[PDB]
Amino acid sequence: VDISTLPRVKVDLVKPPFVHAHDQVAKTGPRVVEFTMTIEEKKLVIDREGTEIHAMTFNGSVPGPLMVVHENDYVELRLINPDTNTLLHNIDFHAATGALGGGALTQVNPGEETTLRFKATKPGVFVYHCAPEGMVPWHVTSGMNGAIMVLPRDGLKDEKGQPLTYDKIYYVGEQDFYVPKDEAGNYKKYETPGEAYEDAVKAMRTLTPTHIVFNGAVGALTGDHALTAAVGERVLVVHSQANRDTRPHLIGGHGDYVWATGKFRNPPDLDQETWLIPGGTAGAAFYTFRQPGVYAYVNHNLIEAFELGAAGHFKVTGEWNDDLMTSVVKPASM
Amino acid sequence: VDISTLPRVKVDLVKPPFVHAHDQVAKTGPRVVEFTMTIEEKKLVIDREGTEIHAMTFNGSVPGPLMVVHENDYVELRLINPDTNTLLHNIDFHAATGALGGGALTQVNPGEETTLRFKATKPGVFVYHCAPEGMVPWHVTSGMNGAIMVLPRDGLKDEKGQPLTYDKIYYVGEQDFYVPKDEAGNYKKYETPGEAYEDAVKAMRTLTPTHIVFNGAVGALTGDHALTAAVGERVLVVHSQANRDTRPHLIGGHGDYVWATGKFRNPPDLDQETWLIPGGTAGAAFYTFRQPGVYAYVNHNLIEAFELGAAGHFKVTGEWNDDLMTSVVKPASM
Amino acid sequence: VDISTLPRVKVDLVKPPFVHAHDQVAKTGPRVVEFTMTIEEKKLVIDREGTEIHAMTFNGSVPGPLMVVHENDYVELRLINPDTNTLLHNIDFHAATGALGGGALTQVNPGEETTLRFKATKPGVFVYHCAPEGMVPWHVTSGMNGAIMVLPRDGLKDEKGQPLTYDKIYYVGEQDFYVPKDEAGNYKKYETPGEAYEDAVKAMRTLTPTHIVFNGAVGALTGDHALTAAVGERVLVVHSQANRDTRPHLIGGHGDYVWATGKFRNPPDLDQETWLIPGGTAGAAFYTFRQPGVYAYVNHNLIEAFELGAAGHFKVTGEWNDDLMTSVVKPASM
């Protein structure tokens, strides 16, 4: 079908962990879904100590926002690199076919823009990331990655073919940072990106992250920004990691249905405690909450979670079920 | 059904790698299954060089013992922290739903005890571990973790729905330790847990284990303590890793049916050489032995196996099958 | 059936990434398939800087060559250790059952040979590697590993039971090296294998590779040695890693059908972006190319790919499909 004959719909993106509006089951035929993102190089404070890095972002956030389409829609992205930036950037979609996922067609210097179109032929959650030839891991590990969800036209299905419908969705982007250290162990800072580059390469080659965070900073998904749900609600958590493996776990819950490597033509794994999302992948977990209270959502290398930053919280409202769990005898000396 | 109307059964636990008595197919309706564990802080020698650490244990062992129930039983655990210990502890069951897996309800100071009940609503093998707020990875990586198996009421099934019945079961707990080192590379020792804490945190933040062991020490599952089997026996090996990925492999055999991420509502993977158990997970592998002799069972990062400790042995009795394997010409000069 | 009554066929191996001739669907009954490999200790330059190591090889290459048989054939390997070598070697097949995969029966000193036979009872791709008692990870991480493919007698099948037939096959062996470094960070060199051994053990115990390469060196699968295909061709990429996890990704494509842990009795995962091959495993991915141009094939820890060596290329011939992807507005200032 001639693409100029299809409907166009413009999406207005939101900041993670929230997700723009969409319908699980497609309410129209295939469409050209129009997105715009503006690259922003910016300083970000990433820990409680005040460590400040030069982040490279899509739309001002780490991770970049979640894009949502259906299978056999066309994604049309206007990518803007304002002249207030200093570096060359591009974009590679793991959802796309050809030209390095789009990276070979989207190289933009400061003061340039470009528009890419691709057909979303495979359903699943997928990573997108910047990847300029010769400086790929530097851009990705400076925060320049997000994800796209390509829903089946008839929505999600369980291992038997019956519908799975979520009530809420969140997007957790997990970021490994490599902040250069001196011989004594303290972070260095740098005056220009070029003066930083060799020590960024040195720091990356150790293979050891200094920080591993959700939504761009230690503690970002806690306090006033904890995730929320109610007892009985069905929640989909999309989780991406563009560079290193992670092992997500809902402390106090499970992944009732999990696509660990993110592709919806496969049946989900049931009843997971913890699952492996390989570096370079997006995964998705569906859970129905059964108990109120605080939960933590972590990478279950618990050092990475509780010392390096890879931990967030849910606050869940509703009634407690003593059949599922109860304290029979509360802690006491006797 | 009112829980006070159900049968109660008391379990008497055994030391790993052995497993307490149970029936694969449930011989009764749902029960309250009663367990007791006593926390023990103790010194342990973990390598051939004599390196001694302060371990934190459930029931005196690293790992803690394997607990076994059926789906929709209630687990009722009496957890005792004697006044000979010095620290606060608790317990989180990945099998349980609510209150951080039980951790929010089981905080016991030295000289206290508590009793927790939860309904085992999902079948599989699952990690349990201590997790005190603010010091979670320290307790877990001091050895304070084990596993629980929740069997389907009608026992295990293959990828086609037919029964799988084991003749023997073993539990291998794999432990990553982070023993602090001085600048020259030698381990330090410490006079109190508080004086140790900052350097334990420093050691953990390197993300690099000093030791990775089965059943609490280098060589623990060898010699007089090698695992055993006979040709033709069906063996289930439950394997847990509460903090880091592992990649188990039976040298000379296979995993004929493997639940790599441990949850029995999913069909097993067939004919595995090696499989990935993510950190924070228990997995299980079923094998029927076909050849006698010595086997090694390893994490197949072979550095981790043969230099850091992650290797045990089977000794298998019976007749050799020359159709499966034979030396046609023995090593010789010619 | 008496093995002396079966047909014998002699295979002549080829250097990776190419694969010797075979038929996907078996054209005969079960056979004794005869292979010969000669061990070669040799110097190899592994990076652009000229770093030279002492490699330990099967047949002169890192990885060793891909062997191909069908399920229930017998593999008969003549393994030769010439007197120009200095070390003891052997071979363990993850495809085989008993005697440590063959390692206990194949110990050859320089100037010796041996012939091993085993029945290939399980279909899949599997690692083979040297494993001499007490020096296993040293030999494996010096390059002494390859893979064997055991095809189902009726060829490969998809998740629904229909045939999958490849037009081309390649074998990518991925090698983690641990070249010892002095305190300043420069590689050391050594006069004899014995004088090298303690520092090789020290380097391995850091768990941090210095190099991670495809086909034995940085850049080996690029330039005049890039992999090739045409639009519309079906390609199987077999990928092994004998010691560490990897996360393969075709940049610009997908794994349409992937056996991540390599065993063909299981249904493949569909539409993968990236997949996890555990250390100690071979995996296989099937893709039909849809677009011409250059692709990169990587470990998607992008530091490991683009700084440490784990990246190769495809050059694909044919016509571009603007429906799948197009530049709507080329990069420009406006």
Ligand SMILES: */O=N(/*)[O-]*
């Ligand atoms: O039980 N979650 O660390």
Ligand SMILES: */O=N(/*)[O-]*
């Ligand atoms: O073949 N097991 O290392």
Ligand SMILES: */O=N(/*)[O-]*
């Ligand atoms: O999109 N491949 O790094």
Ligand SMILES: [Cu+2]
């Ligand atoms: Cu960029």
Ligand SMILES: [Cu+2]
């Ligand atoms: Cu990528």
Ligand SMILES: [Cu+2]
């Ligand atoms: Cu504790």
Ligand SMILES: [Cu+2]
């Ligand atoms: Cu946990």
Ligand SMILES: [Cu+2]
């Ligand atoms: Cu060797």
Ligand SMILES: [Cu+2]
């Ligand atoms: Cu092996």
